[PDB]
Design a protein around this ligand. Structure first.
Ligand code: ANP
Ligand code: ANP
Ligand code: MG
Ligand code: MG
Lengths: 379, 379
C-alpha cells in the first residue's frame, strides 16, 4: 500500500518527471537549423538533449524579457565555455530589487531564483508581451545545474547581490550584498548538470543550437544587441535574421528564392518565400522560439493561403497543397500568450485575444503571388 | 515589490495557469472526428474547450489503466447527462484499497483523488503500459468540477468507500465506509465547473467528442467492453474501430479505400490506407489519444515511407511527398512513455526505449504497395 501509492514533493516530481518541465532528458536526432563554427547557419542532422537546450533557453528568454521591464536595455551577452562547462547570460537595463520581500522574508533574487512558482508575470491585468508566464524557468535551470550563480545590481536599491546555488538547487549560502552606484545588470552563470542528460561535455551539436538561439534573439528582440563569446552578432532586426536562411539560396529550378516582407505594425513582422520541402515555419512569440508553431502561424498562413487560392482559381487546389509550398517567418508580440507546455513550443492563444492584428496588405498578397508559390501549384 | 514579485501555491497555480495542466480553457474551432447522434462517426468543424474535453479524458484513461492493475477487468461504463451536468465513468476489476495509508494517515482514495502529486505510477522500475505517469489527472478533474464523487469497492479490504468533493476540490466531508463482500468497481461521478470554461451547458459538440473518445477506448483497450449511456459500443478490437473511419469510403477516383492491417505483436496494431488530404495519423499509446503523434507514429511511418520510396524508384520522390499520401492508424503499448505536457498529445520517448518493436512484414509492405499510395506518387 505505502510503496504502491506514493506522494511526491514538487521538487522530487521535477527530477522524477523532467519531460513536462524541460522536455525529453534523452537524446534526439533530427534535421534542424544550427549555427556551426565552420558553415554558420545551416540545416543538418543534429543529436542533442532537449532538456539541456531548454534550461539554456529559459535564461535567454528571461534576459529578452528584461527589455519589457526596462526599454532602455541595449545588450545581452552570451558566453559558452565547453572546457569549463560554464554558460553565462548577462543583460543591462534595470536589475532586480536587492531588498527583503516583506511577505516571503527573503531577498527578492533568492525568492525568484531559489523557490518554485515565483514571478513578476502572475498579474494578467498588465497585458505584458514577456515570454515569462509560469514562474518556473529560472528554478528549472537551477535544479538542472551543479552550480547556479545570480548576480544583479540595482542602482535604485543602491546594492549588488550575488548568490550561488549548487547540487540541483539543494545547497546555497548567504548572498554577498554590496554598495552599488553604477550601471544596472543581471548575470546568470551556470554549469549544467550533464549527468542529468547522460552527457560528458557540451559537444558541437548542443553548442551550435545554443549559438543559433543567440542569433534568433538578435533577430527577435527589437533594439537589443547580442554578443556571443565576446563578439557582436551581425544581425540588426528580423529581416537581416531571415536573410541568414534565404539570401544565398536557389529553388531547384536554379532561380533565387523571392522573399516577401511586411512589417504590418510594431508587433507583427512577416517574411514569406517558396518551400520545396513541404510547409516550413520559423516563428517567435515574445522572443520564444515556437518550433511547433501555434495560432499565430495559422493566423498569418491562413490569410496567405486564402489569397493564393483566389489567384490560382483565376488562372486555372486545396489549402494543404498551397501550405505545402510556403516557407513563412514570423516575429510577433502577443499579450499574455498561452502554451500547452512549460517548453512553449506551441502557442495556443486564439487570435481574438492577441491584443493586436496582422491584416497583411494587398501589396503583400500581390508580391506573394509572384514569389513562385502560384507557379508550383499550377505546374 | 510585494505586488510585482509573487509566489503561488500549487493549487493557485493550476487555476491561474490551467493551460500547462489541462490545455486551453478558451474555445477552439477546427475540423475533427466526432461521434454525432445523427451521423455517428464523421469529420466536421467543431467548437469546444480543450480543458473540458481533457478532465473527461483523465478519468477515462484512469479506467483503461485499471485493466493493467487487474487483467480480469471486462467493462467501462460512460454516462453523460447534459441536463443534470453529470458525467460518470464506472469500471470493474479490482477497486482501490479502502484503508488508511500508514505514511500519509488518510484513506488511500482520499490521498490519490484529493492531494496533488499522488500515483501508483511513480516507480519506473515496474515498466508499466498504463497511460498514467504524473499523479495529476484525477485531481485536475476534481479542481475543474463543482462536484466530484469517488466510489470504490475493494473485496480484499472488505469495504466500500464514497467521498464527495465540491467547489474546485476546496470542500469535502467524511468518507462513507461500509462492509463490502461483492464484485469490485470504481465509479467517478463529476459535474464539470462550466464557468471555468465560459460554457452554459455540455452542448452537442463537446458531447460528440466525449462520445468518440468512448469509441476510441473500445478500439484501444484490448479485452474491455465499453457502454455509453447504457448501450454497448459495437466495436470489438482496433480493426473494427478503424472501419468506422474507412470502411464506407472512396478515394476521389471513386475506388474504395484499400485498408492494410498488421498485428505485428500484442503491443503493435497498424492499419494503413491512402490519404488525399495530406498526412493523417490516428494513434493511441496505452489508450491515450496521441492527437499530435510522436515517436511511435514516426517509427511506423518511416518504415512504410522507406519501402514505398524503393517501389516507386523501380517504376520511375522525397519522404514528405510519400507521407503526404499516408493515412496511418496505430494502437500501441509503450513502457513508461514520456510526453512534453500533462495533456499527452505528443509522445516523445525514443523507439529504443519502447520495450518492444514493430518490424512490419514484407507481406505488409507488399500490400502497402497496392493500396493506391504508389499510384498517386507516380501520377
Ligand atoms: N535577467 C533578468 N532580469 C530581471 N529579472 C529577471 C531576470 N531573469 C529572471 N528575472 C525575474 O525572475 C522571475 C523568475 O524567472 P522565471 O523563473 O524564469 O519565471 P518567469 O520568467 O516569470 N516565467 P516562466 O519562465 O514561464 O516559467 C521573473 O518573473 C523575473 O521577475
Ligand atoms: N478507475 C481507477 N481504478 C483504480 N485506481 C484508480 C482509478 N483512477 C485512478 N486510480 C488511482 O489513482 C491514482 C491517481 O490518478 P491520477 O491523478 O490520474 O494519476 P495517474 O493516473 O497515476 N497519472 P496522470 O494521470 O499522468 O496524472 C492512479 O495512480 C491510480 O492508482
Ligand atoms: Mg522565465
Ligand atoms: Mg491518470
Amino acid at each position: 500500500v505505502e510503496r504502491v501509492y506514493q506522494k511526491k514533493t514538487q521538487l522530487e516530481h521535477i527530477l522524477l518527471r523532467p519531460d513536462t518541465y524541460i522536455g525529453s532528458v534523452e537524446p534526439l536526432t533530427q534535421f534542424m537549423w544550427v549555427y556551426d563554427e565552420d558553415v554558420g547557419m545551416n540545416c543538418r542532422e543534429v543529436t542533442f538533449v532537449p532538456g539541456l537546450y531548454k534550461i539554456f533557453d529559459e535564461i535567454l528568454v528571461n534576459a529578452a524579457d528584461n527589455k519589457q521591464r526596462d526599454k532602455n536595455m541595449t545588450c545581452i551577452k552570451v558566453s559558452i565555455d565547453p572546457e569549463s562547462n560554464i554558460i553565462s547570460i548577462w543583460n543591462n537595463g534595470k536589475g532586480i530589487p536587492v531588498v527583503e520581500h516583506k511577505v516571503e522574508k527573503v531577498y527578492v533574487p533568492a525568492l525568484i531564483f531559489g523557490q518554485l512558482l515565483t514571478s513578476s508575470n502572475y498579474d494578467d491585468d498588465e497585458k505584458k508581451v514577456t515570454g515569462g508566464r509560469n514562474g518556473y524557468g529560472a528554478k528549472l535551470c537551477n535544479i538542472f545545474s551543479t552550480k547556479f550563480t545570480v548576480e544583479t545590481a540595482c542602482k535604485e536599491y543602491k546594492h549588488s547581490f550575488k548568490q550561488t546555488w549548487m547540487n540541483n538547487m539543494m545547497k546555497t549560502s548567504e548572498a554577498k550584498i554590496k554598495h552599488f552606484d553604477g550601471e544596472d545588470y543581471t548575470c546568470i552563470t551556470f554549469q549544467p548538470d550533464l549527468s542529468k542528460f547522460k552527457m560528458e561535455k557540451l559537444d558541437k551539436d548542443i553548442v551550435a543550437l545554443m549559438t543559433r538561439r543567440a542569433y534568433d534573439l538578435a533577430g527577435s528582440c527589437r533594439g537589443v544587441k547580442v554578443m556571443f563569446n565576446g563578439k557582436k552578432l551581425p544581425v540588426n532586426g528580423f529581416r537581416s535574421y531571415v536573410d541568414l536562411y534565404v539570401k544565398d539560396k536557389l529553388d531547384e529550378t536554379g532561380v533565387a528564392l523571392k522573399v516577401i516582407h511586411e512589417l504590418a505594425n510594431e508587433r507583427w513582422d512577416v517574411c514569406l518565400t517558396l518551400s520545396e520541402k513541404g510547409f516550413q515555419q520559423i516563428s517567435f512569440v515574445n522572443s520564444i522560439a515556437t518550433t511547433k508553431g501555434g495560432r499565430h502561424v495559422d493566423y498569418v498562413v491562413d490569410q496567405v493561403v486564402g489569397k493564393l487560392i483566389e489567384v490560382v482559381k483565376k488562372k486555372n487546389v486545396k489549402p494543404f497543397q498551397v501550405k505545402n509550398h510556403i516557407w513563412v517567418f514570423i516575429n510577433c508580440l502577443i499579450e499574455n500568450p498561452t502554451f500547452d507546455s512549460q517548453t512553449k513550443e506551441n502557442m495556443t492563444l486564439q487570435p481574438k485575444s492577441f491584443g493586436s492584428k496582422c491584416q497583411l496588405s494587398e501589396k503583400f498578397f500581390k508580391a506573394a503571388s509572384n514569389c513562385g508559390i502560384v507557379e508550383s501549384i499550377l505546374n
